[PDB]
Amino acid sequence: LTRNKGP
Amino acid sequence: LTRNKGP
Amino acid sequence: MYVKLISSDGHEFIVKREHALTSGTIKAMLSGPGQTNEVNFREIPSHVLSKVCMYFTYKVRYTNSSTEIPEFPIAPEIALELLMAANFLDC
Amino acid sequence: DVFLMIRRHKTTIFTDAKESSTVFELKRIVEGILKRPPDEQRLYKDDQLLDDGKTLGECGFTSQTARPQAPATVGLAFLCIEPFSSPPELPDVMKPQ
Amino acid sequence: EWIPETLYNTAISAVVDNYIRSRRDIRSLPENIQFDVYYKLYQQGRLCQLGSEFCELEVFAKVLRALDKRHLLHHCFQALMDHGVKVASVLAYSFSRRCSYIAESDAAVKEKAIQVGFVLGGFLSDAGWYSDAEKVFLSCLQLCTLHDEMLHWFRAVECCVRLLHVRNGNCKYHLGEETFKLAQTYMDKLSKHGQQANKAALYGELCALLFAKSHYDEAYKWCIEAMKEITAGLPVKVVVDVLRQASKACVVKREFKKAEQLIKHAVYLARDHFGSKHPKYSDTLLDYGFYLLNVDNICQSVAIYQAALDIRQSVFGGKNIHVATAHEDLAYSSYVHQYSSGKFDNALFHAERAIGIITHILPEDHLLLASSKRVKALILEEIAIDCHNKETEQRLLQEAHDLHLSSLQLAKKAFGEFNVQTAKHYGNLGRLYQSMRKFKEAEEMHIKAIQIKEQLLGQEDYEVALSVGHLASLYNYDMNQYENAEKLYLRSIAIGKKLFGEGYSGLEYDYRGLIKLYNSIGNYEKVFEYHNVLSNWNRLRDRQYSVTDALEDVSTSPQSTEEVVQSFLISQ
Amino acid sequence: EWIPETLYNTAISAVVDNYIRSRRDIRSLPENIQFDVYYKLYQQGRLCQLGSEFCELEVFAKVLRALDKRHLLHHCFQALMDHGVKVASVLAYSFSRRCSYIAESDAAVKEKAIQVGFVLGGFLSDAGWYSDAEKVFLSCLQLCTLHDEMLHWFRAVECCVRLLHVRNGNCKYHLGEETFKLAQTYMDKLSKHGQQANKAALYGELCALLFAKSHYDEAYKWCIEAMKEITAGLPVKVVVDVLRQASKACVVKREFKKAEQLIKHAVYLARDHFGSKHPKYSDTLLDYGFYLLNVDNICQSVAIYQAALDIRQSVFGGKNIHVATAHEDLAYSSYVHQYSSGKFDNALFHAERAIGIITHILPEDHLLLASSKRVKALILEEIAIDCHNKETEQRLLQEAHDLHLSSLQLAKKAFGEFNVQTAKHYGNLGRLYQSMRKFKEAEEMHIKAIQIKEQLLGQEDYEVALSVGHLASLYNYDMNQYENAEKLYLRSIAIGKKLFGEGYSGLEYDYRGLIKLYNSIGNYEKVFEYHNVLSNWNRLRDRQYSVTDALEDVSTSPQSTEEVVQSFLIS
Amino acid sequence: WNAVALWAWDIVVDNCAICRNHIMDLCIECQANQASATSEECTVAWGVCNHAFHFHCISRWLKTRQVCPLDNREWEFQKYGH
Ligand SMILES: [Zn+2]
Ligand SMILES: [Zn+2]
Ligand SMILES: [Zn+2]
Ligand SMILES: [Zn+2]
């Protein structure tokens, strides 16, 4: 878990 | 191959 | 106790009242100013209305029966005409 | 149980009686609606007279042929049984037209 | 306990069994018996005999008039289109031929042919065969175009508002823009001869056209005009549709206090009239689950997409657009909901299912594959980084690369290059490269997404900040460009609390990154400050969890239409 | 060479091209033309035009009277069921509804319907729609038991021998015994009136009913009773059926001398009358490959199953239970043949295809899924062992854990706890638990597997000895119970030598286990001996599998009927 | 007052959908190896979708797929029996 959810 | 075929 | 049923051909089909109350439309025939009661079925011929009355004895006898209910036989030559009478009588 | 209909000219009474029930009380059932004397009335299955003493099942009106969906018919005479109608005969289709 | 069969249903079985000798005298049966016979052909498995009896408009029009059992007609109709019988295409062609012949004939007969076209075209619009309902509606437009008087001008605009709907859902936006101008002519023409109609159905329909093209600033402008025209005499279906699109455009304008007022009433108004098992009420829930997905209420948004899918999974069969758009919405929401948990199994199933449906009922070059193939790619790019296998690591990232490139091509073909939807796929590319370790293009894609989105949406938005965090995590974790990553993190963190609050779910992925930027340089004093509020963020999550289903959140009769339509406008 | 088309074929294409206008007149054509018009609609891909007429009983009764082109009707019908129209369900229901309408009619019509019901129900039984052929035959049986005429009991058994065949393939065994008991009611009553009806096909069904429930002692009792009634005047289809079932019951009784002469005769007898591309011929091959797989003739057993599948993949379309049973049988044989190699890609494809067909056409709680799920699960647990990934190993074993316990419940619910299939599923769980690092559960499964296999079958049997070696391998390789594995390895080998000699392929897994048995406890003198025995087994194994394919083993006219039965009966 | 009360789990499906045994009987795991030494703790577990299964069966199912077998929803236990 590094980045956020996709737009 | 440590066993035989399935019946 | 009995309901006098006449067909388009003038046939007489007197059946017990509890059998004839299965169909909704006949219940409307027996209600209102209609209340042996004479009922007019000028559009329903006698050959299809006989099978309607056979269903009434079949319907009432087979209510909540535990055994496997046999299917009501409706012949191919009458099935289309009987279907229209089934809708109109709300049977 | 036995389910049957009676026809004289155009009448049809969808009454029922037990397999051991007799013609005597069946004939009195007719008097309930037809309001006519029972002794004058006579019934006719397949051109055959029925005695009032014998039961309905003794004359051949067994439960196997008296189902509610396909009741067995018996004529009534005070025979002029009027057929209901001829249903529209569907084309055989498979037969060459 | 073994109730006897009805004489009606017994005669239906006998008539159906006698189909060959009576396949044409059934067409002479009453309206309500024709459907029950043709339903029994579906129930018995006689789809081949039924398919040849719904491809004829002469008998299918009588089936369409059975409004009580329309929920059964949608599932029989979908059964044949799955079966292989192109019922929608044939009915479009059977009505295209009919309109030309009646065009020369009497105008009174043309009125009957137009009314049949609205019922058939409206059904194919309800069933989701938009490309096949546009042809029906275009044919109805030709009949109204030929005559120019007061009687046929009401139908001509009615054709155009219906034709606008079957193009917004079909992603034919380049034709939907001009068909409002054609509709604009008839509104002025009707207004010239002392007559006023309702513009709510037409103004609010293009609100989806502008929303789909990501012209959110222009979409909100037309929502205000749509809300002006709402009156007491409009049908519930019209009022639900304009409340749905008003809520959708209010969300992307980042004012969620007014979108909730419009979508809670829309959910109640659709449920009160159409019931809980209606495809229109299911349409409301997807827009209601679109609101809850964009207000960080994801836990209450999966239960709404799952409820909206179950209506469209039962009213409509498989291989349908309405059960596909319900999958691709739920596949995204389950991906978002299970983003921290990592359980991308239900979300992947709802993503592969929507892929297998669109590729069957829509062409390869359709725009609805842009959203469907994107959601599958987001789930795939997170499954591979979650598993600990090497061969599947390269395959899943490569396969997810094909979809994002394909999703970009279809988006670029329709939305152009400088568009929010096209820039939205750019941010997905940037996250794709970070996992696939192509950092050279990751910074370009992330900054390209930021450039376009800030240029049009603005510098203060929810969408623009999410792409910033994707770039901020790129600089921090691997690129080690801490001098400008920290600025990016503070930009997204500050705006997240302003828009949603301190309990926004995206702040955790920004807190973890920004702490890692500080531990990497040795500054341990500021780290303790965030760990003092990261636990507060977890503490705030405990109180804000409060999983109550949003279906009963709308309750029974909160307000009426008049209060809701004015509360959105008085506050405006 | 550009041969012009026949005017018949040219006129087929012209009528088919104008089908919609003339669809009423085609129904009045001769049956040979009418089938050819309908077959052209299938060839053109117009399944909706074709399927809207096959849903009618009268039209389908006309195309069923073309007996020579049944290999095309079985392929149009299967393509219709895959197309999405339930023609088998409609025709079974349309016949039963029409059959019940002539109960009060005369016996002249009531015998024509039974003729229609035997060519229709016999077609659906041949096509694999046992749940729908049973509904046809129950209506035919109801016609026979209304008028008690002399001919009617002759036909009521003829229903009850086909009503019993459509319940054996549908795994309605608990209705199967009720059917045979009902069959004797009209069989005894017919025998009273000076007419001994031939009890050859009826007794042959119990040779498959009781074999399916693994009542091998009871099945062989009716195996003898069936072949005592074989007469040269019987139909070949009836005769071939008994020889297949007798061969199936003889092999499981651990006797092979009598079994080979029956099935090899049956393979030739089916190849003569029917041909090499007939469903009945493929039925023999699956029963013929049942012989070869059990008698360790494994190399040619794959080809027989592949030959059987190729017949069924052509006659019986894509998704049929007869194709599925050929897939699940070939997948198991490909599992057995490629077990030494360790590569399972063709075997897994067939096993996955079999379940992909059965789950599509049959309910998820049906007994034929027990055999198909078992075959794939044996393949799944052996793919994961051969691969090196731990995550795949921990997932495919659990994926195969789902199938065996799902399969076990299907066998336990239907066959009961104490039966060979239930015990045979325990032995697969014994293999399964051994490979899932749950060693203590693998032992208690094998003990339960043996104590059931040893009880009903007997002390010396193929099935019990095959699972002892797994228990012996468990005590030897991993849980280090070397004192108990010594007697089990010898017990498995002694039974294997008794029924198969030194050519049994499972001795390699037993000799290698014996080598591992002594390398950890001592007595290195026997290690050299058993390695020599393994060496002796190695070159003796390369002496018999090189025999030619078993398809031509039966040759042409090797023996004759009414002589193979007598040769079997005396021995 | 002596009284007799039949206790049962209040599910109406009354059949596990993984093992396919009765919901009141043992699961196929506990009915195959030890039905007396393991039957006492073979309990049932519900879910948010209100589809109770055998706890052994539902855990064995979750070891492969993370969804409810009947309806493909995210699976989360709401209550157990103990
Ligand atoms: Zn079709
Ligand atoms: Zn269970
Ligand atoms: Zn358990
Ligand atoms: Zn569930």
CATH code of the domain containing G61: 3.30.40.10
Name all chains with 3 or more CB-CB pairs below 8 Å to chain E: A, C, D, F, G
CA distance to E396, F2, F80, F130, per residue, from E429 (Å) = 14, 58, 46, 54
Do F89 and E45 make contact, defined as CB atoms within 8 angstroms?
yes
Do the domain assignments include residue C83? Answer: yes
Could you give the count of Cα atoms lying within 13 Å of E455 in the half-sphere of its Cβ? 11
Nearby residues of G50 by Cβ (< 8 Å), 6 or more positions away? G78
Rounded Cα–Cα distance for residues F508 and F506 (Å): 5
Q: Is D17 helix (H, G, I), strand (E, B) or coil?
A: strand
Sign of CA dihedral E237, E242, E246, E248: positive
Phi, psi of E298 (to 5 degrees): -70, -35
List chain F residues with CB under 8 Å of B6: 335, 374, 378, 427-428, 431
Rounded Cα–Cα distance for residues E49 and E74 (Å): 17
List chain E residues with CB under 8 Å of F395: none
Place of tokens 């979650």: E386
Q: Is F346 exposed, middle or buried (0-12, 13-18, 19+ CB in 10 A)?
A: middle
Q: What is the DSSP string of F364-383?
A: TT-THHHHHHHHHHHHHHHH
CA distance to E25, E136, E249, F434, F521, per residue, from F485 (Å) = 79, 79, 75, 15, 12
Phi, psi of F404 (to 5 degrees): -65, -45
Parent domain of G61: 1-80
Q: What is the DSSP string of E481-504?
A: -HHHHHHHHHHHHHHHHHHT-TT-
- DSSP annotation of F4 reads P
Which of E44, E51, E388 is closest, CB to CB, to F48?
E51
The nearest CA of chain E is from the CA of G3 a distance in Å of: 31
In chain D, the number of structural domains is 1
Could you give the count of Cα atoms lying within 13 Å of F167 in the half-sphere of its Cβ? 26
Rounded Cα–Cα distance for residues C58 and F517 (Å): 78
Rounded Cα–Cα distance for residues E52 and F287 (Å): 44
> Could you tell me if G67 lies within 8 Å of chain E, comparing CB atoms?
yes
Rounded Cα–Cα distance for residues D73 and D54 (Å): 18
We report the CATH number of the domain holding residue C39 as 3.30.710.10
Q: Residue G30, annotated ligand binder?
A: yes
Do the domain assignments include residue C12? Answer: no
Question: Which alpha helices (DSSP H) does E128-235 contain, by range?
Answer: 130-146, 150-168, 173-192, 200-203, 206-212, 216-228
Q: What is the identity of the amino acid at F207?
A: C
The nearest CA of chain D is from the CA of C25 a distance in Å of: 19
| CA–centroid distance, residue G54 to ligand 2 (Å) | 4
Q: Is D74 helix (H, G, I), strand (E, B) or coil?
A: strand
CA torsion, ordered F380, F383, F389, F393, to nearest 10 deg:
30
**H helix or E strand, kind and range, residue F44:** none
In chain C, the number of structural domains is 1
Residue E303 · residue E549 · CB < 8 Å: yes
Going across the sheet that includes D2-7, the strands are D13-17, D2-7, D72-77, D42-44
We report the CATH number of the domain holding residue D34 as 3.10.20.90
Parent domain of C70: 17-88
Q: What is the identity of the amino acid at E226?
A: A
CA distance to D28, E496, F280, F330, per residue, from F319 (Å) = 65, 55, 18, 16
**Which residue of E7, E17, E26 is the best one to mutate when testing the C interface, meaning the one whose CB has the most C CBs within 10 A?**
E7
Nearby residues of E114 by Cβ (< 8 Å), 6 or more positions away? E140, E143, E144, E155, E159
In chain G, the number of structural domains is 1
For chain G, give me the number of helices (H) and strands (E)?
1, 2
Could you give the count of Cα atoms lying within 13 Å of E400 in the half-sphere of its Cβ? 30
Do F59 and D97 make contact, defined as CB atoms within 8 angstroms?
no
Rounded Cα–Cα distance for residues F81 and F103 (Å): 30
Q: Residue G22, annotated ligand binder?
A: no
Parent domain of D75: 1-93
Nearby residues of F397 by Cβ (< 8 Å), 6 or more positions away? F380, F381, F384, F432, F435, F436
List chain F residues with CB under 8 Å of C73: 100-101
Q: What is the identity of the amino acid at F477?
A: Y
The nearest CA of chain C is from the CA of F553 a distance in Å of: 54
Do the domain assignments include residue C38? Answer: yes
User: A-contacting residues of E 310-339, CB under 8 Å?
Assistant: 335-336, 339
List chain C residues with CB under 8 Å of E8: 83, 86-87, 91
Residue-wise over G22-55: b if at least 16 C-beta within 10 A, else e?
ebebbbbbbbbbeeeebeeebebbbbebebbbbb
Rounded Cα–Cα distance for residues F209 and F178 (Å): 12
Do A7 and E428 make contact, defined as CB atoms within 8 angstroms?
yes
List chain E residues with CB under 8 Å of G72: 346, 349-350
Do F24 and D97 make contact, defined as CB atoms within 8 angstroms?
yes
The nearest CA of chain B is from the CA of F421 a distance in Å of: 9
Sign of CA dihedral E489, E491, E497, E500: negative
